[model samples]
Target: VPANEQISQLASLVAASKYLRVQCERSDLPDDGTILKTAVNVAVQKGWDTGRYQSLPQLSENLYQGLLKDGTPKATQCSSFNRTMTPFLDAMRTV
Candidate 1:
């Protein structure tokens, strides 16, 4: 699938998942940009391992660890990732 479509699909999946939706809301990030950035990045980094997790809290902790494992500063990483993931997150939020 095209990159844009893949993003949309992921967003839809996340939005439809009650666990994921609640986790995203509970994060209370400053914006959807940050939320998407963290979520997509975590999904990417986790790869197939993400499917092994059965609960939101497990996935949430994995995402947090992924961010910390990255050597770049948290703020900088979020800012950079926000540019690419914001659109998907925006669409997801409205669902």
Candidate 2:
């Protein structure tokens, strides 16, 4: 799938993660806080300052939810959510 499609495929999880990140940034919360929120939210909050590629989990989660919504159709090669979730876990570790 195209990158956009990949993104859309997991939109829900990605949306939640994105949202969670924004909330964390705006609150000046610790990385632990980010991780805690990452476990739940997925939309990018307004005015959140997420530096660099920190929102990878949100992106991946979005992709995961996007693909799931699209129905793991064959020939799509949808990877496991856990496999793409490494960065979020890594980020949490740094928190």
Candidate 3:
């Protein structure tokens, strides 16, 4: 399979992560309860802030495997999702 196909799923995850980061930035939350959102959002921010997307084509094979190698827990699932989206999200930050 060409990398473009793999890129779409991972790309969408980046889009969502970007959305979360922006929401955190624009947040007023009506109360002072926005701290944790910022925390997780920043984690996403830094997680994706790598040059992985530039090499996404090659990264896909390994990422794709990681996505499905094995997982039955909630944490495991998100970790996989995180791995899939990281690199491409980094590119979005560049320009």
Candidate 4:
């Protein structure tokens, strides 16, 4: 009857688990790197898809540079927002 401490921990964990999962999904989890990266990649894909970039360095040059500009942090923004969520997303899957 004296196991209230552990039980409470369970309750708190349960609460946090619920909150994170709910918030994670409701947070529009795609706007970060996922969205930017995908959008940039999609547009870039169109270039090659339509034969607009049939060369080497031209494609490679703009390749990562495109994502580099779009994917990396601008000191803090949606990119970082996506980056921050990356870890939480992974850990939550196991939880």
Candidate 5:
């Protein structure tokens, strides 16, 4: 399986699923919750910000790499609904 095929499959899976859930590490937060203050939040936000409709493989790589904070890996696993996952998948399907 090539990377593009894998991305296509992942896109199909996300599109077919009712809900998508992904896990990442947790990190510190500020007093006011204005942005994705946590580690996982920061990772996801950064991923989406950098690659809004890029390749799935690149996006996944970014998300996985983003799961770190202050040189320390994710200690606690945080789960989220991943609202952008589906839209990203939709974009990948057309690519």
Candidate 6:
């Protein structure tokens, strides 16, 4: 896919995920971006063996353009579910 389209899809996925709003607004912890960067790094290090894509950007693209699509959302619930879990797991590991 074209880069802009890819970005738009990713932006939409982020928009849909309520956790992202929490990340941007919550003041009790480190910046959400830092947490997210670390989590992605861990996933890359361990090998994202069980997911639809291997890296952050690839997973983001798959989420945006593939799973989050209207008709496929239910079928792709795993991805959305993972999006919710990743940050929490990342936080737990740090604490």
What TM-score do all the candidates reach, one by one?
0.38, 0.27, 0.26, 0.26, 0.23, 0.30
User: Model 6 — TM-score against the truth?
Assistant: 0.30
The deviation in Å at residue 47 for candidate 2 is 16
Model 4: lDDT equals: 0.36
Q: Between prediction 2 and prediction 5, which has the larger TM-score?
A: 2
lDDT of 4 at 50: 20
lDDT of 2 by residue, 17-56 (tens): 3434442232332343455455333323322333333545
Question: What are the per-residue Cα lDDT tens digits for candidate 1 across 2-84?
Answer: 44444444454333232223433335333434454445555565453334234544444454555456586645654555545
Instruction: Give the Å error, residue 20, model 6.
Output: 6.6
Model 3 / residue 83 / CA error / Å: 2.1
Clash counts for the predictions, in order: 0, 26, 1, 0, 0, 0
Q: How many backbone clashes does candidate 4 have?
A: 0
Task: Sort by lDDT, best first.
Answer: 1, 6, 2, 3, 4, 5
Clashes of 1: 0
Winner by lDDT:
1
lDDT of 4 by residue, 1-95 (tens): 23333233223333322333333343533323333333334334334232332232233334334433564454443344345545444433433
- RMSD (Cα, Å) for all candidates, in order, is 10.1, 11.4, 12.4, 21.4, 14.5, 9.2
lDDT of 6 at 4: 45
Candidate 3, residue 88: lDDT: 41
Question: Worst 10-residue stretch by lDDT in candidate 5?
Answer: 25-34
lDDT digits (tens) for residues 1-28 of candidate 3: 3444434445344433433343333231
